[PDB]
């Protein structure tokens, strides 16, 4: 709506914004992340992982 500036999801986290100059609606998504798992055989067998 013309009077609305930001946006929030169900858990009250910003996920949209209006550009101050061009007045465009831009989506915001966090950059990727995750865990790291290492698969190895017995260390007395080899050193490849």
């Amino acid at each position: 709506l013309p009077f609305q500036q930001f946006g929030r999801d169900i858990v009250d986290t910003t996920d949209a914004v209006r550009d101050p100059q061009t007045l465009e609606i831009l989506d915001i998504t966090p950059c990727s992340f995750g865990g790291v798992s290492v698969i190895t055989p017995g260390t007395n067998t080899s050193n490849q992982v």
């Binding site: 999801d9 169900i10 858990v11 966090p30 992340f33």
Partner: peptide, 27 residues
Amino acid sequence: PDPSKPSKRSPIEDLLFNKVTLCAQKF
């Protein structure tokens, strides 16, 4: 099991899987 269905599930299992229905974001 019903061979016609691509998932190879019995009709009762199909109804059981369709009955249960499961947010899912904001990592």
